[PDB]
């Protein structure tokens, strides 16, 4: 029955998004996950463009964290553009795992 | 003399690097050089005799390990490189002088 409440989370979400500074660093959510076993496989399934692109952005952002400088206001990731490009890839990875776990009960 | 304004004005010497990574390529190309003299200079034949010593080597050189240039000998013996070559790039106002080597991704540092 979410019309008021779940059309307003976008506001805390939006507030939160830019609150976490990765925003500023040129980075995108997908590029911030913890690199574990599922995430790895997922990353290994990324097409060359998608994947070279994450490499550049972490290469840009770590560059910046080294120098403690934030990117220009002009050049910052905008919440409206949430490329959850890993999500697709990540999901199955997980999906395949859970199955593999489940098939292993009896 | 109003022509005298050198059209051949020195070019400023800069010790930088430009690294352009492409793990999609099989071998590695490195050109390392320090700045040298122009075309005309006593030091400039002496340099050549010094590059004579280092030499220049290829996958196909018949003498590999018995080459006399210890650089050659070492890449021959230890499969350190595919092909290397010293050069002295003579220009008016400046130069480029050093080696250039091609090798595996796991060999760059020993070659250097």
């Amino acid at each position: 029955a979410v019309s008021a409440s779940s059309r307003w989370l976008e506001g805390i979400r939006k507030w939160y998004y830019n609150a976490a500074g990765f925003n500023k660093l040129g980075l995108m959510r997908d590029d911030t996950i913890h690199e574990n076993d599922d995430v790895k496989e997922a990353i290994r399934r990324l097409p060359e463009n998608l994947y070279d692109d994450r490499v550049f952005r972490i290469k840009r952002a770590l560059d910046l964290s080294m120098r403690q400088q934030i990117l220009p206001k002009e050049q910052w990731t905008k919440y409206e553009e949430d490329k959850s490009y890993l999500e697709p890839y990540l999901k199955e990875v997980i999906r395949e795992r859970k199955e593999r776990e489940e098939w292993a009960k009896k | 003399d109003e022509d005298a304004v050198p059209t051949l004005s020195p070019c400023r010497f800069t010790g930088s690097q430009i690294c352009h990574r492409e793990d999609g390529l099989p071998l590695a190309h490195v050109a390392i050089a320090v700045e040298g003299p122009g075309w005309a200079h006593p030091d400039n034949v002496a340099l050549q005799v010094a590059n004579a010593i280092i030499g220049h080597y290829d996958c196909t050189y018949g003498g590999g390990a018995h080459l006399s240039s210890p650089l050659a000998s070492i890449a021959a013996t230890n499969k350190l490189c595919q092909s290397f070559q010293t050069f002295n790039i003579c220009y008016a106002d400046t130069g480029l002088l050093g080696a250039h080597f091609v090798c595996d991704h796991m060999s760059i540092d020993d070659m250097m």
Binding site: - | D58, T60, Y61, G62, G63
Partner: protein
């Protein structure tokens, strides 16, 4: 490998005495015609 896309092609083999002459030298090495 060197890209062979344009008009530039001009390789075809036929010399006087020597034909398909391959050399292996102690220093240099190659393949001519």
């Amino acid at each position: 490998k060197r890209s062979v896309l344009c008009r530039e092609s001009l390789r075809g083999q036929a010399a006087g005495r020597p034909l398909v002459a391959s050399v292996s030298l102690n220093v240099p090495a190659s393949v001519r015609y």
